[PDB]
Structures are given as C-alpha cells and as structure tokens.
Structure 1
Amino acid sequence: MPLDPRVEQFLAQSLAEARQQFKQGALLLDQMVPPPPVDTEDGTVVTTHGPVRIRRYIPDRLRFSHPLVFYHGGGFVFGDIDTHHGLVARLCQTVGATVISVDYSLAPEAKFPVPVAECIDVARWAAHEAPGWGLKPSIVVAGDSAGGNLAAVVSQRAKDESLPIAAQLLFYPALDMVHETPSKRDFARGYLLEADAMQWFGEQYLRTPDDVSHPWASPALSPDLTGLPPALVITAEYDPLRDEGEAYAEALRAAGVPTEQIRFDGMIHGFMTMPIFPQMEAAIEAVARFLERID
C-alpha cells in the first residue's frame, strides 16, 4: 500500500529518437531479467488497412485451448513485438498458450481508428486459424494500457463483427479519454505515465479532439456491457488510469459479465513489462489461474 520498495528505487532512477529510446529501455530491463526461451514464428496478416506484422509464440507444452491475441501498449505511438517480448514469452510459457503478438500501425502515421480495425482483423484471422492449430475457434484478447484499450474495444465489437472471443485480459488499460478520475488527478505526475504524455498521445492518435467521446476510443462509455467476454482487469494502485480500469471492471460485473478485478498495491503503471518487479510474474500467474476458469 506504501509504494513498493523496488518501484521507489526505480522511479528515483524527435519521434524516431523517442521510439528508439523507449525500445532501448525495454531491452535494458530484459537484459537485467532475461525472458524464458520460447519458440516463435513471424508472419504477416492481411488486414483492411494493410499488412500487419505478427509473432506467434508456441509454448513448450500446450495447456490452454484458445489462442491469445496480444496487443502491445505504448500510447498508440510507441512499442513493438520486441518491447513486449518479456511479457508475451512468459504469458506463453506460464499459461501454456499460443500467443499472437501484434504490431498494429502506430500513430501519428496512422490515426484512430485504424489500429482498432487492424486488431479486429487479426483476431478474426486467429479464430479462423485456431482449428488448424488444434485449438478452439474462440480467442482470448489481451493488452497493456493502449493495448488494453484495443483489447476492450475488440471485445465490445466482437458480436457485431461475428468474432468469437472467449475472454478479455486488460492490463492497466486506458478506457476513458473523456473523464478526469481521482487517480488521473492524484497520480498525474511522477509515476512514469504522466498527464502531459497522455495529452500528447491523444494529439498523435486522435483525428480531432471530439474523437475522445467515440466508443471505439473510449469503451468505458458504452451504455450496455451485457454479454461481453469474461474479463480480467488488472490495475496498479499508483496509476492515473487506475480508477477508469476499476470502474470498468465494476460495470462489467454489474452487467453480469464474469469479471476478476485485481489491484496490485504499491505498484505503478507498466509493471507487467518491468521484470525487475516480482509483481509482473505474480500478475502473469493471475492470468493463468483466471484462464483455468474459462471454458
């Protein structure tokens, strides 16, 4: 409930250049706490907005009967398959799941709602492939932060798009671009994800400031959450995005959606791609236990 000791220690310490610096940070942490070996295959999915690079992770031993489709975070501007490899490799090996890690088109080069369309296309592709992998033809979508946004919106669009989704895993997602929450006010600066950056991400991703109220940008605003896929919503106590994540979990639960909501106390935004924190593996264990309950 106090700030985690290791998190405390960590905090105490151009667009191309910033992407590279973000990527260098991600590599540093993986160099500090190396990921498990895992078999992978690269490929390209043909989407309605063009080819989208993917990487399939194959577990040593398959124990989960649905493919996972994973959408990386990074404010819609940063990140790639490599920045999220540390997380995805452990998800693959710990759950015993095939995982499709997706490189959707980044902003500002591509703008809302291009990545949403891409992410749907990839989920549909995964569902079609699943029987040939000897899996069920219903997928688990997953993502961190901006990727959690994508996972939540894909889940909301699933029925309309005839997309079978068995569950949604939202890791400290962004869900509400319209409302200030107490967490967004109280942890606006100094906890890695900052208000300044969130504003900037919005300027890169969104076409106009009015897009904030679009349900494919702000899924928390959808008035009807009935019949949505079973949900695991993981939040960090000291994350501006905390409150909107918990409120969405609460709304899903009240809508009769099977929902598990976990706040990691003492933690900050981003901890599930920061293997210097033991909590990252604890949260990955949470995922495996949750997925055990899914049919």
Structure 2
Amino acid sequence: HMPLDPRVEQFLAQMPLSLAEARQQFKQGALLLDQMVPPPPVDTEDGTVVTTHGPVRIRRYIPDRLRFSHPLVFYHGGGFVFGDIDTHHGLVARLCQTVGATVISVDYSLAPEAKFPVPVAECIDVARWAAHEAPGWGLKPSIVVAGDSAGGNLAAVVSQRAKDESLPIAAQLLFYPALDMVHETPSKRDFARGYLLEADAMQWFGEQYLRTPDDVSHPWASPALSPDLTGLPPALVITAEYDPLRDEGEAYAEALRAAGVPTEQIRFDGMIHGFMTMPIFPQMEAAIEAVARFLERID
C-alpha cells in the first residue's frame, strides 16, 4: 500500500557479537539518535522497587507542569534482551513533558539471564508499587501502563492480569507490541526482512526469553491468545505500516474493540517498527501527541 516515509526510506538506505557487545551496540544506537535530536530537559529521581523476583531499578519522571491525574508505568522494549531506562529516555522524557504525567520507567530483568515469566511478575509488582504511591504524589491510584515492542507485550499482559492481581489500571498504551508468538500473520511473513526488526532476531529473542518452545502458547507470552478481553483497560494501540508485528497489533485492537474495550487504533503509514524511540522521525512526536489526546479522554 502506502509509500515509505521519506526520512524512513533514507534511514533504511543508510543502514549497515557477544551478548554484552550486542547490548552495548544497541545502547550506542540509542545514544546517537538522542545526540541527533536531543530530549527535553526533565526532572528525574532514581529508585529501586522490591519485587517478588528481586530489586528492580526505576526512574521517576516529574513533568514541569502536572496535568494528568494517573501515574504512567513504562516498560521499555528491546526483545526482552536489550534496552534499559537510558535507551528509552528520549521517549519517556517526551511522554512526561507532553502529557504532563509522572512516569515510572522500569529496568526489568533481561533475558537470557532471567527467563519468562520473570519480567511479567516484576512489571506487575512495579505497577502495584506505583498504584500504592500515587496518592502521595497527589494522583489517582489507578495507573496507566505503557510500552514499546517487547515492552508493549508486558503492558498488555500486565493489563490482562490486573484484575486477578488486584491492580487498578486506567489504560494501556501499546506501541507496536509483540502479542502473538504462535501465529504467522501476513505482515510477519512479508515484512520480516529489511525493516529493522527481522525474523532471525525475533526467533533469537524468543530463544533467549522463553524457557521452552511450548511457552509461545502461554497467554502471558502471547496475550493475543486470550479468549476473553471484556472489561480490560481502555487501550491505545499504535502500529507501523511496515512492521512484521503490525497485523497482530491491529488484530488485537479489533478484538479489544469488539469486546467493548474503549480502543483507539492508529497506524502510522510508511513507518517502521521502533519509530517511537527514533526522534529523527516527526511521527515519534505525532504519536506522543496521540498519547496525550487519548489520555485527555480517560477522566
């Protein structure tokens, strides 16, 4: 369908290890993008949450002007293997300042050192911590969960587990999430080479994160498999046109909508996976404005 965005096209055309080296390479790429398009200044405070699987470092972002009445809890992407609070600073800083929201960015345990479902547990525990702390920040105790890619998987799973875990969640923001590790979709078949997120990489991420191949069918790995989506938190689902994960994201949004979940589904045309941590693309800021607009309607 639609042409590639021009800046995206140029980026792809200009594109060209041990685990430690690969993690460093990912961090170096994130730094370079931040150097090209610097993040907004923002007040932050570091801390550590005691979870059921150990200490999890967090960073709380405080907006210049607080305008949104729920804390956001943000889970970074990176295939469950890469990324951290610093790689996703450019996005989180902008979410904080544009929405005018307190944001808790989470440094959950990475694979393969920690395996499925450890980060899911951690992410629930941090969300619960935030809900407990919210009144002392002058906020409502119901949280908004958010994440990109693998982080969007975590946000979606936390949301599905929330009622069972007595966790109050007001909304879920899924940025090009991974949701279905079982089924091939047309986008996954057709866009899995040459658009930054590759088939070989996704297979390797699964090998690092999952305990055994059978885990693909577990709903905490593949939340799109869950048959009952009724009563789940209001959902914003942002996809990229030329992303292998596009179709599972959009299908999940359709399923949420049909289950009576208030859902906004936005495809950014001509875009690729990862664009909301790539500030060289104006669509990153457009999508952050979509977040602000969506969250305005929650209260």
What TM-score do the two structures reach when normalised by structure 1?
1.00
| Aligned counterparts of 1:285 and 1:53: Cα–Cα separation in 2 | 28
1:187-210, Cα deviation, whole Å (9 max, x unpaired): 010000000000000000000000
Q: Following superposition, which runs of at least 4 residues in structure 1 exceed 6 angstroms of deviation?
A: none
- Separation of aligned partners in 1, 2:31 and 2:170: 32
Cα distance, 1:236 vs. partner?
0.1
RMSD: 0.3
CA distance in 1, matches of 2:192, 2:82: 20
Partner of 2:10: 9
Aligned with residue 44 of structure 1, among 40, 43, 48:
48
Residues 3-53 of structure 1: CA deviation (Å, up to 9, x unaligned):
011001001110000000000000000000000000000000000000000
Offset of 1:279 from its aligned partner?
Answer: 0.2
Q: How many matched pairs? A: 295
Note the C-alpha offset of 1:282: 0.1
Query: Unpaired runs of 5+ in structure 1?
Result: none
SS in 2 for 1:233: strand
- State the Cα distance separating 1:233 from its structure 2 match: 0.0
Give the 3-state SS of the residue equivalent to 2:73 in structure 1.
strand
User: What do the CA deviations read for 1:112-141 (whole angstroms, capped 9, x no partner)?
Assistant: 000000000000000000000000000000
* Secondary structure of residue in 2 paired with 1:252: helix
Instruction: Provide the TM-score with structure 2 as the length reference.
Output: 0.98
Report the CA distance between 1:72 and its aligned residue. Answer: 0.0
Q: How many angstroms apart in 1 are the aligned matches of 2:13 and 2:41?
A: 31
* Gaps in structure 2 of 5+ consecutive residues: none
Q: Deviations over 1:87-108 (max 9, x none)?
A: 0000000000000000000000
User: Following the alignment from structure 1 to structure 2, what is the Cα–Cα distance between the partners of residues 176 and 15?
Assistant: 25
Q: CA deviation at 1:59?
A: 0.1
Aligned counterparts of 2:141 and 2:113: Cα–Cα separation in 1: 33
Cα separation, 1, equivalents of 2:47 and 2:105? 10
Deviation at 1:159, TM superposition (A): 0.2
Distance 1:79 1:254 in 2: 34
Cα deviation, 1:134-183, whole Å, max 9, x if unaligned, reads 00000000000000000000000000000000000000000000000000
Q: SS of the counterpart of 1:263? A: strand
Report the Cα offset of residue 110 of structure 1: 0.1
Question: Quick one: percent identity of the two aligned structures?
Answer: 100
Distance 2:31 2:126 in 1: 26
Is 1:248 aligned to 2:260, yes or no?
no
Give the Cα–Cα distance (whole angstroms) in 2 for the partners of residues 144 and 59 of structure 1. Answer: 21
Which position in structure 2 is the counterpart of 1:55?
A: 59
Structure 1 distance, partners of 2:212, 2:54, is 23
- SS of 1:153's equivalent? helix
Structure 2 CA distance for aligned equivalents of residues 124 and 59 of structure 1 = 21
Whole-angstrom CA distance in 2 between matches of 1:72 and 1:129? 21
Q: 1:65 aligns with which of 69, 74, 88?
A: 69
